[PDB]
Amino acid sequence: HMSLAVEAVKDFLLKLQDDICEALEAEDGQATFVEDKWTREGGGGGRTRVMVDGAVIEKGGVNFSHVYGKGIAGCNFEAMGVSLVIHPKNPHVPTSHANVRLFVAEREGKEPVWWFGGGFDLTPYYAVEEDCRDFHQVAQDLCKPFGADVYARFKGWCDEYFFIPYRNEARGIGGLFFDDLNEWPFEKCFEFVQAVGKGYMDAYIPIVNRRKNTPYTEQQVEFQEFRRGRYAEFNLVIDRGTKFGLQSGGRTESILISLPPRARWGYNWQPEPGTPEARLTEYFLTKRQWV
């Protein structure tokens, strides 16, 4: 077993949830996260913290989970992580997502198998060049202590993963994404995920503070809602964690914090040409070179 290492990761994750929620509550100023603590028989449980109808955060969820299972298909396992999605009220604040997680499977006769996964990413509506650059700079900078090609690898993985092929469209401007991370000693992988967690706040919170009071119109909210239909489609059609989780006994409401508060769909809907709305897909979502 790796019992003591796992306990350290768990303590990190619970503190990370607290810290992220505190940061976001400070930006909002009005609403607070409410916790829904849940268990499943034989299976662990989680702490789902949600914000609704804030001054800044219309719909936000920061989930901690620690699940145990018996059936590597036959192995006892534990999986723990923090996952979050934030949907601002103001269209000029991007949506964001982050995750950090560890999986450990105990093996008859052998050393345990383990790996980390995670990342963070930004989904603007009314994007701003310097925010996209600063987000990626935080990502790049946090990676540098861990290896010269770590940013390139995991930024590229993010662009590959958060993509809707049948619309030939990225979900957002990118960030970092990694899975199956065990090529470094455990302590180095743990350091890297702690860096990722801190980096989410470092990357996202300044943007929220900078953008939350930008003036906006009902037409910009309509665009936000049609864009949020695209977001719902990625999560429901493409995202593997959401798909597996719903298919396999996961806690529906915890999994689906990713879904937007309101979404719109229209036949052949597209942004009007020559507008800031159109520039999100014509320029920001295809640039994929921010540092």
Swiss-Prot record:
Q: Which residues form the active site?
A: 97
Annotated GO CC locations = cytoplasm
Pfam families per the UniProt record, alphabetical:
Coprogen_oxidas (PF01218)
Cell compartments where the protein resides = Cytoplasm
Q: Does the keyword Cytoplasm apply?
A: yes
Reaction(s) catalysed (UniProt annotation): coproporphyrinogen III + O2 + 2 H(+) = protoporphyrinogen IX + 2 CO2 + 2 H2O
Alphabetical GO biological process terms: protoporphyrinogen IX biosynthetic process
| Record-listed E.C. numbers | 1.3.3.3
> Where, by residue number, does substrate bind?
83, 99-101, 249-251
Molecular function terms in GO for this entry?
Answer: coproporphyrinogen oxidase activity; protein homodimerization activity
Does Cytoplasm count among this protein's keywords? yes
List every stretch annotated Important for dimerization.
50-59, 231-266
Q: What keywords were assigned to this record?
A: Cytoplasm, Heme biosynthesis, Oxidoreductase, Porphyrin biosynthesis
Task: Write down the superkingdom of origin.
Answer: Eukaryota
The biological pathway it contributes to is: Porphyrin-containing compound metabolism; protoporphyrin-IX biosynthesis; protoporphyrinogen-IX from coproporphyrinogen-III (O2 route): step 1/1
Q: Where are the transmembrane segments?
A: none
Q: Where is the signal peptide?
A: none
InterPro entries attached here? Coprogen_oxidase_aer, Coprogen_oxidase_aer_sf, Coprogen_oxidase_CS
What role is this protein assigned?
Involved in the heme biosynthesis. Catalyzes the aerobic oxidative decarboxylation of propionate groups of rings A and B of coproporphyrinogen-III to yield the vinyl groups in protoporphyrinogen-IX.
Q: Which family does it belong to?
A: Belongs to the aerobic coproporphyrinogen-III oxidase family.
Subunit organization: Homodimer.
Xref: HAMAP family: Coprogen_oxidas
Please give the name of this protein: Oxygen-dependent coproporphyrinogen-III oxidase
Name its species.
Leishmania major
